[PDB]
């Protein structure tokens, strides 16, 4: 049972899932409205969104007295973010500007990837070594979509029996997608293309917000119970509350290197020969060069117009 990292509006916390009766430890305090959270374990980084400060920030968790540092600003409603620990990129959703955007880990070279047919985008999860990204949208057309991490090949993978898809995660060992619906009160799973859908927790979840996974156990936050719940990822059995009395639980991850396992970066050692962004891609050679918003890629497929 891993440590669980969760946002909590005023702070980010870590709790040991084998001992959630104990009080969590505060990783970063003095926050206004921390909502999304993720990490790059190998770099010693934790990132979060703040929906009042309209920003994504980061902290260096292996240093003593390291500051909070703003890396992306002007984000009207950054309701979801994911760290690409392989390609070294930062992806996020914005439910007010209706966008999915990427940048480098320091916030540089921002590129809007999607800006059409989004209403209430929320969760976002990455499979960097396959070059795919997955997100939810709880708006007027509720759905789960996937696309290349380079913005290619966008596809709706779930569009039925869905209404408030809030939580989304991947099982990297089994190659499965899991999601939690706060209106339909359930957690389901499917293959990565949306096929072979199955119920895991069939009902009775009051208001799940974010979902993560470690080994054979799912973990999620619930806005109505103010707690983290867990159950078996195959059967939904063994449903237990492991940590409760949380001020305002938000996004959550199993905080482990094993959830970001080592793989070769297809960009190699020279940024893919790309002048600006080298993004993961689902097709060979498994990266795609890219440029900041509004900037054209030249005919070589590598160099942004200078």
């Amino acid at each position: 049972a891993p440590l669980l990292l969760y946002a909590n509006r005023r702070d980010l916390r870590l709790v040991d899932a084998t001992n959630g009766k104990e009080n969590a430890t505060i990783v970063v305090g003095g926050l206004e409205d921390a909502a999304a959270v993720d990490f790059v374990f190998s770099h010693g980084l934790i990132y979060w969104s703040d929906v009042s400060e309209e920003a994504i920030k980061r902290t260096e968790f292996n240093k003593t007295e390291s500051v909070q540092n703003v890396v992306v600003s002007g984000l009207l409603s950054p309701d979801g973010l994911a760290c690409d620990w392989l390609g070294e990129k930062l992806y996020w959703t914005d439910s007010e500007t209706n966008r999915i955007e990427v940048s480098n880990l320091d916030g540089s070279l921002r590129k809007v990837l999607f800006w059409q047919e989004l209403d209430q985008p929320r969760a976002i999860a990455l499979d960097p070594s396959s070059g795919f990204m997955y997100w939810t949208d709880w708006g007027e057309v509720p759905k789960i979509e996937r696309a290349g991490m380079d913005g290619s090949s966008r596809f709706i993978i779930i569009n039925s029996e869905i209404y408030w898809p809030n939580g989304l995660t991947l099982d990297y060992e089994e190659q499965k997608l899991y999601w939690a619906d706060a209106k339909l009160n359930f957690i389901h799973k499917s293959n990565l293309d949306g096929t072979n859908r199955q119920a895991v927790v069939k009902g009775s979840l009051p208001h799940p917000f974010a979902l993560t996974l470690f080994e054979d156990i799912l973990y999620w936050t619930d806005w109505s119970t103010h707690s983290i719940l867990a159950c078996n990822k195959y059967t939904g059995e063994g449903l237990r509350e492991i940590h409760s009395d949380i001020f305002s639980p938000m996004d959550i991850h199993a905080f482990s290197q094993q959830r970001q396992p080592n793989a070769t970066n297809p960009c190699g050692i020279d940024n893919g020969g790309c002048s600006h962004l080298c993004l993961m891609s689902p097709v060979k050679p498994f990266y795609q060069c890219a440029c900041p918003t509004g900037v054209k890629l030249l005919e070589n497929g590598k160099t942004c117009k200078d």
């Binding site: 309701d79 809030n166 706060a182 209106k183």
Partner: peptide, 7 residues
């Protein structure tokens, strides 16, 4: 506002 991320 139901399901929206508050404040």
């Amino acid at each position: 506002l139901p399901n929206a991320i508050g404040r």
